[PDB]
């Protein structure tokens, strides 16, 4: 039996940024949800639609794991119907979203003295993002009525900003690793099943 590789998802060396969030497809394997209960400190383990107790006896076609790292205070922004910088410009979940959200502390791996600037988010944008939309554009944002000519200056800004994670921060400003499990089953034969 080929057990599904949730290990290479949760136990990765590095995660993805918020504006470029990583997506992994898993299928053609048997999935056990007891192993996922390892890594005892869980900041949040919340599921919508199906229940975690009844998750073991279910079948789907494919599963999609979306992984990234955010600030602690931003965790509550990874739920349906949430508003914020992360939920408006970086990562969006639909209102009818059915799936599981797992957020756990990562202060011991993703925090460096002097600033861990590898994690970035989007601050400015012309409009909001639609559900499951990823934007990696790097165009200059215009806040006035004069062409910027592709150079920053007065009323012309750079959209992407960077987190400064350090170990001495507070719990709310500490990095947190977030993984979202979305289950997709189709009218085709189901493939993802448990024991």
């Amino acid at each position, epitope marked *: 039996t080929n057990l599904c590789p949730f290990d290479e998802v949760f136990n990765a060396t590095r995660f993805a940024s918020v504006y470029a969030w*990583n997506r*992994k*497809r898993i*299928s*053609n394997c048997v999935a056990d949800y007891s192993v996922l209960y390892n890594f005892a400190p869980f900041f949040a383990f919340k599921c919508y639609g199906v229940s975690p107790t009844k998750l073991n006896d279910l079948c789907f076609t494919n599963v999609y794991a979306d992984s990234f790292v955010i600030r602690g205070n931003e965790v509550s922004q990874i739920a349906p119907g949430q508003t914020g910088n992360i939920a408006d410009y970086n990562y969006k979940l639909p209102d009818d979203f059915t799936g599981c959200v797992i957020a756990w502390n990562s202060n011991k791996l993703d925090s460096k003295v002097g600033g861990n600037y590898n994690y970035r988010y989007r601050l400015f944008r012309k409009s909001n993002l*639609k*559900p*499951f*939309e990823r934007d990696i554009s790097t165009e200059i944002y215009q806040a006035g009525n004069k062409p910027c000519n592709g150079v920053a200056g007065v009323n012309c800004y750079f959209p992407l900003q960077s987190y400064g994670f350090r170990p001495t921060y507070g719990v709310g400003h500490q990095p947190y690793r977030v993984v979202v499990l979305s289950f997709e089953l189709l009218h085709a034969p189901a493939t993802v099943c448990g024991p």
Partner: antibody
Amino acid sequence: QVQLVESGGGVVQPGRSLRLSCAASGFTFSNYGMHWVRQAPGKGLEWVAVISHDASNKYYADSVKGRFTISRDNSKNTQYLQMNSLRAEDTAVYYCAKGGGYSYVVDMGPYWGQGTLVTVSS
Amino acid sequence: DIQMTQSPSSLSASVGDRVTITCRASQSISNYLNWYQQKPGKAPKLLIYDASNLETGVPSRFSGSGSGADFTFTIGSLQPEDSATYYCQQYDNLPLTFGGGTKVEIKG
């Protein structure tokens, strides 16, 4: 049992219009989003257009910019493409491909149609 | 945009050999590459998805490998039923770009 069927191809004189349709069965067509790709006779594949799930984000190729229009018909399980100002080298076989759900417009793979063939000659 | 090159453009192998294909990229695309098989007059069929993962209803002889920019595809015990054209495609960003292709002739 997911099936994609393309239709509307044929012969058209240069400088006219033509509409292609892709009919889908076996999934909730209203919230997935779709792609149009084409292959010239004796050449490789060439991506043409993509449309999101609702019908609010549309993306096109530069070589077909200003003449092609992608539309959805969420209800009829059909996706439509409109072609205008057709020129000499637009003869090809067109496939419609299933994408990733919601506004994930960079997904495609194991669900293709059989293709419909379009020529532009006098 | 994104430019990707397939090599070799043509390959010939005997019935009991091993065939390897290469596909490059002009930037880092991570595990966002997939391979297609196309017989003459038929739609492409997905063989390897997400940078070396196997799909349903495929022999175990088909195996991928790669990350970053350069990717490799490999076949195991070759069989007479493996004459087609193989394509690599990226799905990292805007307009999705295919490759030139590789035509495989079985020499007997």
